[PDB]
């Protein structure tokens, strides 16, 4: 029901979440330590667990209500832990092989995003990876309208309940997105040696930074 609704609301769900899982699996060992930042109900963590049965997952979010859904999802998983913390709070020490996030960091002020990327690099092993599945802003107001039309086209084609899309729109009024190339450059500024946009469907993109490679 919830997982079904996320697919209705998010264009190219399988491509974007799948790209995050694939780039992690090609970058870290089977026994990787992975932090999911803003894990919510643990959808990205769940996608990673499907590919990496031996990975240790730490799911972090500020919302206990969202993390209760993650606890239920991972009830029988002995290699999953949960941490309640804001992105702006001290990160867990790690070190981590991967830090991943989906549709969470766009909630922060731009300065706090730039600082967060730097703080993430500090808890990554050398050669570690940061991956973000993100809601991104178009580089112009005219393109932003086209991004919006493409998002709405997916939502309508997916037979999304009108009430859930209306609720989606209200949530998006408080979002602080920026264009994908600005954020990717912030990874370079944070001291990641490589940063790339792996996959994109207009408003939604999967990008990554590597801590040494
Ligand atoms: N400043 C902040 N610190 C921590 N978590 C935050 C946050 N701002 C938003 N969040 C969390 O980010 C999540 C956004 S929804 C995305 C959930 C999950 N990553 C998924 O892919 O489905 C929510 O769980 C919300 O509580």
Q: Give distance in angstroms: CA of 123 to centre of ligand 1.
A: 20
Q: Assess whether the previous peptide bond of 95 is cis (omega < 30° from 0).
A: yes
> Taking the CB of residue 161, how many other CB atoms lie within 10 A of it?
11
The arrangement of strands across the sheet holding 33-37 comes to: 80-84, 56-61, 33-37, 96-102, 124-135, 204-210, 194-201
What interhelical angle do 43-51 and 64-73 show, nearest 10? 30
Assign domain 2-210 one CATH number from 3.40.718.10, 3.50.50.60, 3.30.360.10, 3.40.50.150. 3.40.50.150
- Tell me the CA–centroid distance for residue 20 and ligand 1, in Å: 17
Q: Which of 21, 44, 61 to mutate to test the pocket of ligand 1 (most atoms within 8 A of CB)?
A: 61
Is residue 64 exposed (0-12), middle (13-18) or buried (19+ Cβ within 10 Å)? exposed
CA distances from 181 to 115, 187, 202 (A): 17, 10, 13
Alpha-carbon dihedral 167, 113, 18, 28, rounded to 10 degrees: -150
The verdict on the CB of residue 81 being under 6 Å from ligand 1 is no
* Token pair of 123 as six digits: 């808890």
Using a 6 Å cutoff on CB, does residue 87 contact ligand 1? yes
Q: Whose CA is nearest to atom 23 of ligand 1?
A: 40
Domain segments of the chain: what residues?
2-210
For ligand 1, pick from 40, 91, 174 the residue to mutate: most ligand atoms within 8 Å of CB: 40
59 touches 41 (CB < 8 A): no
d(C-alpha 135, C-alpha 15), whole Å: 14
At how many Å resolution was this determined?
Answer: 1.6
Nearest CA to ligand 1 atom 9: 104
Find the helix packing angle between 180-189 and 110-123, rounded to 10°.
50
Place of tokens 């997952």: 57
3-state secondary structure of 190: coil
Query: Which residues are 80's β-sheet partners?
Result: 57
Q: Which of 57, 73, 87, 107 to mutate to test the pocket of ligand 1 (most atoms within 8 A of CB)?
A: 107
């Amino acid at each position: 029901t919830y997982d079904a609704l996320r697919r209705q609301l998010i264009p190219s769900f399988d491509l974007l979440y799948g790209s995050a899982v694939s780039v992690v699996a090609m970058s870290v060992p089977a026994t990787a330590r992975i932090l999911d930042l803003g894990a919510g109900t643990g959808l990205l963590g769940a996608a990673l667990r499907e590919r990496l049965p031996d990975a240790e997952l730490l799911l972090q979010d500020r919302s206990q209500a969202m993390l209760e859904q993650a606890r239920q999802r991972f009830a029988d998983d002995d290699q999953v832990a949960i941490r309640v913390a804001d992105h702006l709070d001290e990160l867990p020490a790690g070190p981590f092989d991967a830090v991943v996030s989906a549709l969470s960091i766009h909630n922060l002020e731009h300065q706090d995003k730039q600082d967060l990327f730097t703080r993430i690099r500090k808890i990554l092993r050398p050669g570690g990876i940061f991956v973000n599945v993100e809601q991104v802003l178009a580089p112009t107001s005219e393109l932003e309208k086209m991004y919006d039309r493409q998002h709405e086209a997916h939502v309508l084609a997916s037979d999304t309940p009108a009430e859930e899309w209306a609720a989606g729109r209200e949530r998006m009024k408080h979002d602080i997105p920026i264009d994908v190339e600005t954020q990717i450059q912030w990874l370079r500024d944070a001291g990641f040696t490589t940063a790339d946009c792996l996959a994109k469907d207009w408003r939604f993109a999967t990008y990554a930074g590597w801590n040494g490679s």
